[PDB]
Symmetry: C4
Subunit: 292 residues, 4 copies
Amino acid sequence: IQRYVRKDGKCNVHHDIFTTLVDLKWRFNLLIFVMVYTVTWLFFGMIWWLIACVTNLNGFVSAFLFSIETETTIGYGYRVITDKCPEGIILLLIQSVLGSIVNAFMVGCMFVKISQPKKAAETLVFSTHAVISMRDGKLCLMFRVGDLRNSHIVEASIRAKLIKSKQTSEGEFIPLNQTDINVGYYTGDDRLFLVSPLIISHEINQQSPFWEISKAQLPKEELEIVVILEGMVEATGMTCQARSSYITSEILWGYRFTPVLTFYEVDYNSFHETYETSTPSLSAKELAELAN
Amino acid sequence: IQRYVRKDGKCNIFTTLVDLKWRFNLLIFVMVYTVTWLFFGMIWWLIACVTNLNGFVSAFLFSIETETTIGYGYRVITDKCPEGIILLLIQSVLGSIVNAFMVGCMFVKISQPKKAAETLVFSTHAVISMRDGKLCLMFRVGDLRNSHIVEASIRAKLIKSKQTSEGEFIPLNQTDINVGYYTGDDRLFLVSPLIISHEINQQSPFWEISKAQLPKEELEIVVILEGMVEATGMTCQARSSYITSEILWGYRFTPVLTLEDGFYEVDYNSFHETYETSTPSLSAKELAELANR
Amino acid sequence: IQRYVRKDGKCNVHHDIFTTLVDLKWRFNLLIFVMVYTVTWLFFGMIWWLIACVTNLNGFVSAFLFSIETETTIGYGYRVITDKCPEGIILLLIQSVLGSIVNAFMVGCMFVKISQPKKAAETLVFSTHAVISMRDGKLCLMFRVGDLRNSHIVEASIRAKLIKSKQTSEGEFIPLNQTDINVGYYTGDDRLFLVSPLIISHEINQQSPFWEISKAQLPKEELEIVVILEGMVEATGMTCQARSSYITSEILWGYRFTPVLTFYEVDYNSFHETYETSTPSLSAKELAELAN
Amino acid sequence: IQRYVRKDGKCNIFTTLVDLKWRFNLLIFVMVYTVTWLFFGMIWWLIACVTNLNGFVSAFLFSIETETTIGYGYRVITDKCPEGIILLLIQSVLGSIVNAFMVGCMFVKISQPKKAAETLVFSTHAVISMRDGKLCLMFRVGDLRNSHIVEASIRAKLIKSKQTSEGEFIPLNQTDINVGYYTGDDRLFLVSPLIISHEINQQSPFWEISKAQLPKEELEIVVILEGMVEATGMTCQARSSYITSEILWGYRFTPVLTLEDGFYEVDYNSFHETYETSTPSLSAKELAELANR
Ligand SMILES: [K+]
Ligand SMILES: [K+]
Ligand SMILES: [K+]
Ligand SMILES: [K+]
């Protein structure tokens, strides 16, 4: 049994032309466009030849240069239009109208491909390990988060899902039952502001799915913490998502994050790195019972 | 009377054009252009500045070649008149306005949020059965697309008539169904088709409704899903509705998740399918009293 | 002392070029554009005349037709470009680049003006009177809401502000102190779905600013209920706002809305109309005290 | 060390271009076009299909007239070569890509959300004083524009260092300041400049901080306001920051609202202004203990 979300953000789960085109390399992309235009010019060029209104046209090649010069609106005036036919005068209209729509679509896509905010999502980095340790009387599940590029994407919001197999009192099996892990939702502390990389901290309370799990129970647990971080880029109001996961073994008990902060200079080497201090090995449940 | 939202989610001067079908959208535009070319072509003829123009037809080819900015140079402009030099300006400016309406209509017609979430599907039925002691109304949602949805989120309303103690009748009362609102669990991480659960508690409009009352009842659950397309800046939306007959009592969804060679296989044939299980005939209210004693 | 928000949605309170242009009539709008283009053609036409590379140009008028034919990219070829000068060849570049930006800006605006969702906000209608009456044991402040056009804008969300003069224990005067009136926020019942016109219902509870006010107290009260309704149009994901107000005298005690529903045919005449039934004249506070 | 957000809200291949100043934005583009015209012009010369072309300069005017789609017809295309007929296609297609980047950069550069809320202003100072028994941190926000903001909403974070009982130091702890989140009162109806209030209760990071501690403290309040421009589909945003010295203790905002002939007059000179009032020297915590006994 392997994981459901990989550290980078791909799902290990199998099943708008714009959204097709964005996922395509420039190799393949440039190519869509050239074709889409040629096939219109081929199509319309063939209709001029079916119309033979035309000036200086001698072969197949001559009708092409016109079709293009008409649709692109160049019109050198070596190949002009006359009045002797009804059919050619009206084709030019249907062409120039359609030559507008096909253009708009292509530029719409061309923009959507370049506008895509998928690039900004790359510098968004998650810590490699999640750590459970004590923090102000309470046992806290913690992980780091931030951006590798300082300028853009400071505003964001974190959420976390917990995926585990489940069986109900009634016996129904829920394979990937997810429940939301509170990373600051009720307070508005999940609305992040990534000046620097921040430690996101889930407080292990009575509502926490980690309530009754101790240091010993932990590795003997088949759970996965999915982490979704979505933020708005600084130069553009366009927002992008970023995911990483944490399987059971990826969570270190008794550990605490290595502070990356030292003018303010941010040390990106220490980012993923963690250290352990003396931390109770007990479930947050039993710690709270003995606290009372 | 009928429903208000169909299974496919559809309900029962610029907006007018984007609401139209493509087939017509283009047809209107063709007219819209001809009528500008007719109008402006007629003004060139009223101006007769012109070169090689002989009849009505000749002024047209110019009007078009001017507005489309082709200009073959068989029909050029001279200087002898004031009127023609300035018309060309008013034409070329107005030729941008018309163009903008078209591209405007494009961008909008395509990037509408119904057309983005077309890959999001809702299960054909809702089901009412027991989950961990609580009676639950459930339906299934799923993305066929691998292109995930940013800030995906579920919500549902119940459209049923009701009457107050004071004798006030509300013909089409709407009360929101909780589908994870208070916990955050209504913000979906939607990869595998999820089974959304409304826990029929005290606050549920389904609190008092039993197995034998279910068919006799007259109501409509509307299910709405809004996120953002990961790749575009534009929103996606998926609606669906469950009328009283599509809400199966005492049934469960067939699991769509299987482990197949370092990957998990989702069977979308099983997506809609449901199976019957032993489930109480009482309302969630009446079960609460039984368990209370 | 008059109101702060008028029934239509204007504020009785005194104090991006796109947002300037949207508010302008087509009379004035068409006009901005024509000017913006002429002034570029005048400017660039004058630079061709400063350059005198040119073919068949005789007066001021001749340089204009070129400047236009170059910027609009027409180029009839009665006025072509030669090679004898460095200056003209490079101007054409600066023109065609700037002739792109000035165009883009104009079409950007032209779209933003037509795309404006201000029109859809018109058919959005509010009831003329707000009514306080009993509804399932509880005293409820109620008002109607809906769209005059059936097709578009069914999804919306209601919120309500309450504006009243205020003075703190410490003596600070807050002239237009607003507090949010719960019209279904905590439940998600404020997320409307306007199949038909709906009665929005504020439950007068211990949190309600109308808690301690009875039928007698009501007219002797200097309060205003601001009502913001914002919804997304059906054909376009573009969303628009719509406001109406309710001053103290606009709220009828003992009254209940006339049901507009009777296939389903919606009776838009009865929309604003209301009727009174036997309703307790007591503050929701004292009614709850005697209920216990 | 310095702040992270300035008073004006600004902090301390495509995104690279939209982040640039206009002056440069255009300059880059001029190059971007010349280098395409140079490149393609050189391919026409490598092709030498051409009419009236004599030197290097002649191939340029064509390359441009072809890419810009001008085409004067002094330099036309013939049929004798295969190579030239097909280059023109690759050129005219690639001439759209470059154009799209430019318009792309336009649309984006202008409709960025900082540039929309430029009319939203924040008060220069924050103030800490008493309101209806509760100690309150307040700041003022205001729209100079009459064009209102759809779904306007306030939020604030406090950037202060702290240390846990277990000896864990958090260099730049962020804890959200409540400015109406739980009630809905953080959704602003923003016409008149509002005085946003954080009630310094048990949950406030300012709970324990007194008058004499205030200056000695090292923290940063960040204030963020997001709504939508009523007229455009695009978002607007206003940031500002209040460093420890901009938070006046025991002060109050001067009222900006006056009744003047069937209308109300807002004085924006008074917007930023504050006045001192008798206010306790204790923390909101210590006042709570005094009142408790
Ligand atoms: K052209
Ligand atoms: K041309
Ligand atoms: K020509
Ligand atoms: K031409």
